[PDB]
Amino acid sequence: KVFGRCELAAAMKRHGLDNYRGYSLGNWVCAAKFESNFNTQATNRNTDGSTDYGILQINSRWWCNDGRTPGSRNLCNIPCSALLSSDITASVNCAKKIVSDGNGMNAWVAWRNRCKGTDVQAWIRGCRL
């Protein structure tokens, strides 16, 4: 499913991301825009053989099992295909574990390079929330 900007903002708020670990909603909507263009079915292969999955591009090296990343962990306890669903519940639950791991939202390279330090409130303007 490809989300609209305000539809995804609403769904993230409902699942408790808004100010989660100090990050306002606009930070999460900005990261999803630059990681996947709001498409729950996005995948991308990395040079080490791992793959990133779903609206927040979560990586199979640490976080999920895809049966093809030898010697990796599965810290979220889920198959990576669960992260491609139109229901974002699995992605959001796993993102809360990643952001808690010590490096905050710096875990997402697009957030650090394109959202960090910008006016992120802009991503939720005009939305009914």
Q: Which stretch binds Cl ion (CB under 5 A): 9-17, 44-52, 90-98, 106-114?
A: 9-17
- Count of CA atoms in the C-beta half-sphere (13 A) of 71: 2
Q: Does 24 bind Cl ion (CB under 5 A)?
A: yes
Cα distance between residue 24 and residue 76, in whole Å: 23
Q: Does 87 bind Cl ion (CB under 5 A)?
A: yes
Annotated binding-site residue numbers for substrate: 101
Q: Does 54 bind Cl ion (CB under 5 A)?
A: no
Does residue 12 contact residue 25 with C-beta atoms inside 8 Å?
yes
Cα distance between residue 19 and residue 36, in whole Å: 22
User: Is 35 known to be catalytic?
Assistant: yes
List residues binding Na ion (CB under 5 A). Answer: 60, 65, 69, 72, 74
Per the residue annotation, which of 52, 66, 87, 119 is the catalytic one?
52
Q: Does 19 bind Cl ion (CB under 5 A)?
A: no
Query: What letter does residue 22 receive in the DSSP assignment?
Result: T
**Residue positions annotated with a catalytic role:** 35, 52
